Amino acid sequence: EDRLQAVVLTDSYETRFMPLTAVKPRCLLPLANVPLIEYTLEFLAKAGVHEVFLICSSHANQINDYIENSKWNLPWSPFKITTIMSPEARCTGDVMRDLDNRGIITGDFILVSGDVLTNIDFSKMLEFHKKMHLQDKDHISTMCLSKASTYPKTRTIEPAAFVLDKSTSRCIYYQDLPLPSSREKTSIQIDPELLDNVDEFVIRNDLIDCRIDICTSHVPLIFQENFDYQSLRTDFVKGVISSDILGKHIYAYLTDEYAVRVESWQTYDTISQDFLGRWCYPLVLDSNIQDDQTYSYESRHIYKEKDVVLAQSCKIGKCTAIGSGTKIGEGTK
Amino acid sequence: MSEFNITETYLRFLEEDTEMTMPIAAIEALVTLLRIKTPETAAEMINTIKSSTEELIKSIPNSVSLRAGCDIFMRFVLRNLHLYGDWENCKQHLIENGQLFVSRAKKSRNKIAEIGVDFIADDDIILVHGYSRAVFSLLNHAANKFIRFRCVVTESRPSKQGNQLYTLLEQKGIPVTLIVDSAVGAVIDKVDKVFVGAEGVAESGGIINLVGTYSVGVLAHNARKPFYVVTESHKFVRMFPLSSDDLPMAGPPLDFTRRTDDLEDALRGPTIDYTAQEYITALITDLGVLTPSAVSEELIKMWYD
């Protein structure tokens, strides 16, 4: 209930953004004139948390000075902020077990892997997780995800296919769907021995991955001695449900609206325009919170700050965003 | 030894600078009237200006912006003689106020440019009509802010002033067209905002400036655009019609006398129109932005007694 712990980890997609990222992390990159550290931080400020735990396996010196220039080292933030330095190529999960060997984390706590952006409430996620507590003592976690309804196959890097229960929404199995432009590897496999006590169960694709899971502190200790797991869902959510451990129930969660996580520039292409449009209701841009901005809204999605020198005869089309210190010229578009 | 009436004080400094305008030039002449000619008695001081203002109306009968200046100077020296100083200090207590308006009413227009900023917004095509110089100082602040807009200048016929305003702000660097006043009705749909300026404000809110500000005002109400008007806090006169007929220049607006030899025939109609409260929607003072009903009450708050 109380003492909402969390764990924030960047630095897993340095492979993805290699022409960039040589001087600054992926999480430091500006989505709409401002980076995406604080997109998560204000979202777990909405969660009502008490402490965070950063992971900086690379570029560690230029993280905390930005936090020193943030509002988060100043004592009215929802959480005190802590960092953990690390050397390079320290993958997910092995960041957990060494932290589990430290063992600060107590009770329930928040996994945020990648870098996320959403509009989902913290409320209805959590009593649903407590409904799993009141329905199971051998529970694991509840994985909240959205529903990319009209678009399959444009979740760019990896397509993720999920099978889960009708009633309890217990995730039955995970198998990674191949590349959809590759018409060759056309087979999935789900072993029906573990399909005993469900008998009506839903197998989906469009649950767009955002890695936003919260769980108790027992399941990293379960994850501890199973040291041969290296990912979050590529290996561990399979092996915890593929009959090897006996009687362990992980749930997922589906929402009817926006939650997303950056994978490539193509994800950075889409959700930047979705955030610039009103698809990120209510978390909108003219709130102006982070570097306490001066954006004023105009119709057809115009995001202008002050000190904006707009020249004559330059048409500004739909879905644009302009900061200060800027000067457009004549005849531009 | 001056007499302050016609040109021995007044028309000297009207050739000094065309930055001072007509009513405060009369205010500049009226404050220096009693300054030098201070006849050490409260009685004939006001009887001096009652002689002097009524010949000043008699001097130029058709510049009734001066009459607003002739109006409020009496309203100045009345309450300035109030605070009850028995005329002992009130000789000095008036002239220590004294040079107020040559320090304050001269900075009417920049204070208009302080608070008239957020009317001309991003990409507003602006309809102006007549040299009301507070508009240009608002437009001077608009160019100095580098805010984005355009401009449209009408005629000012027969008073010619629209030809000046095109030359006045093209050198300032604004995209602008001069349009004829005849082509307002076919162009006003593209026009969004419209700025004019009165020579004086009547009791319901009056536009007593030029020939066809009421014509462009009644166009804008059917175009349903915010018909703004720019003036300042010393441009108020009691003179108030019931129709759009003020005092004319010399004769009725429908003359039918003939041309003797070569007399001017465009100059047969009026040169001053009137607009009531119905067609304006907002105005600017040194006090602030002002609704057309508050301009009635402040013109009556110290005017009934």
Residues of B with Cβ-Cβ distance to A310 under 8 angstroms: 122, 148
Decide if A282 is inside a domain: no
Beta-carbon separation of A309 and B146 below 8 A? yes
Beta-carbon separation of B148 and A298 below 8 A? no
Interface-testing mutation among A300, A312, A313, with chain B (most B C-beta atoms within 10 A): A312
Contact of A286 with A295, CB cutoff 8 Å: yes
Does residue B252 sit at the A interface (CB-CB below 8 Å)?
A: no
Does residue B175 sit at the A interface (CB-CB below 8 Å)?
A: yes
Beta-carbon separation of A311 and B148 below 8 A? yes
Buried/exposed A308-321: b ≥16 CB within 10 Å, e otherwise: bebeeeeebeeeeb
What is the H or E stretch that residue B284 is in? strand B282-284
What's the first-to-final CA gap in chain B, in angstroms? 37
Report the candidate in A215, A12, A36 with the shortest Cα–Cα distance to residue A114: A12
Residues of A with Cβ-Cβ distance to B146 under 8 angstroms: 309
Return the amino acid letter for B197: G
**B227-230 sheet: strands from edge to edge:** B176-178, B150-153, B125-128, B193-196, B227-230, B282-284, B289-290
Decide if A211 is inside a domain: yes
Decide if A26 is inside a domain: yes
Contact of B205 with B283, CB cutoff 8 Å: yes
Nearest chain A residue to B175, by CA? A312
Distance (Å, whole) CA A54 – CA A200? 41
Decide if A327 is inside a domain: no
Decide if A132 is inside a domain: yes
Answer left, alpha or beta for residue A52, where phi above 0 means left and psi between -120 and 50 means alpha.
beta
Read off the tokens for A176. 């990674």
Tell how strand A54-55 and strand A116-118 pair up.
Answer: unpaired
Nearest chain A residue to B176, by CA? A312
Place of tokens 């003020």: B246
Question: Using N-to-C axis directions, what is the helix angle for B108-115 and B133-145, rounded to 10°?
Answer: 50
Beta-carbon separation of A309 and B122 below 8 A? no
Distance (Å, whole) CA A260 – CA A253? 14
Tell how strand A160-165 and strand A171-176 pair up.
Answer: antiparallel
Decide if A195 is inside a domain: yes
Phi, psi of A213 (to 5 degrees): -125, 145
Burial of B305 (0-12, 13-18, 19+ CB in 10 A): exposed
Contact of B156 with B129, CB cutoff 8 Å: yes
Does residue B122 sit at the A interface (CB-CB below 8 Å)?
A: yes
Distance (Å, whole) CA B87 – CA B70? 22
Distance (Å, whole) CA B289 – CA B285? 6
Q: What is the CA radius of gyration of chain B?
A: 20
Domain hosting residue A163, numbered range: 5-276
3-state secondary structure (DSSP) of residue B43: helix
Interface-testing mutation among B148, B174, B176, with chain A (most A C-beta atoms within 10 A): B148
Answer left, alpha or beta for residue A211, where phi above 0 means left and psi between -120 and 50 means alpha.
left
Interface-testing mutation among A295, A296, A310, with chain B (most B C-beta atoms within 10 A): A310
Q: Looking at the DSSP assignment, which residues form a beta bridge with residue A203?
A: A163
Contact of A43 with A88, CB cutoff 8 Å: no
**In chain A, what is the greatest distance between 2 CA atoms, to the nearest angstrom?**
71
Phi, psi of A156 (to 5 degrees): -75, -60
Give me the number of domains chain A comprises. Answer: 1
Contact of A135 with A167, CB cutoff 8 Å: no
Report the candidate in A142, A201, A192, A135 with the shortest Cα–Cα distance to residue A166: A201
Name the DSSP class of B246. Answer: -
Residues of A with Cβ-Cβ distance to B175 under 8 angstroms: 312
Question: Using N-to-C axis directions, what is the helix angle for B90-97 and B22-36, rounded to 10°?
Answer: 150
Report the candidate in A161, A170, A160 with the shortest Cα–Cα distance to residue A199: A170
Nearest chain B residue to A306, by CA? B147
How distant, in Å, are the alpha carbons of A245, B68, B252, B298 from that of B265?
Answer: 107, 30, 15, 41
Q: Which residues contact A272 (CB under 8 A, 6 or more apart)?
A: A31, A32
C-alpha B268 chain-centroid distance = 24
Read off the tokens for B146. 């580098």
**Measured at the alpha carbon of residue A189, what is the angle toward residues A186 and A190, in degrees to the nearest 5?**
150
Does residue B84 sit at the A interface (CB-CB below 8 Å)?
A: no
Decide if A318 is inside a domain: no
Name the DSSP class of B146. Answer: T
* Residue A219: HSE in the Cβ half-sphere, 13 Å Cα cutoff: 24
Cβ-nearest to A310 among B148, B150, B175: B148
Q: Which residues contact B304 (CB under 8 A, 6 or more apart)?
A: none
- Mark out the alpha helices in A12-93 (DSSP H runs): 37-46, 61-68
Return the amino acid letter for B230: V
Distance (Å, whole) CA A326 – CA B142? 18
Interface-testing mutation among B118, B146, B177, with chain A (most A C-beta atoms within 10 A): B146
Q: Looking at the DSSP assignment, which residues form a beta bridge with residue A174?
A: A162
Beta-carbon separation of A312 and B122 below 8 A? no
- Here the CATH number for the domain that contains residue A36 is 3.90.550.10
Decide if A300 is inside a domain: no
Read off the tokens for A205. 């694709």
Residues of A with Cβ-Cβ distance to B122 under 8 angstroms: 298, 310
Q: Looking at the DSSP assignment, which residues form a beta bridge with residue A204?
A: A162
What is the H or E stretch that residue A298 is in? strand A296-298
Tell how strand B125-128 and strand A160-165 pair up.
Answer: unpaired
List the determination method. cryo-EM
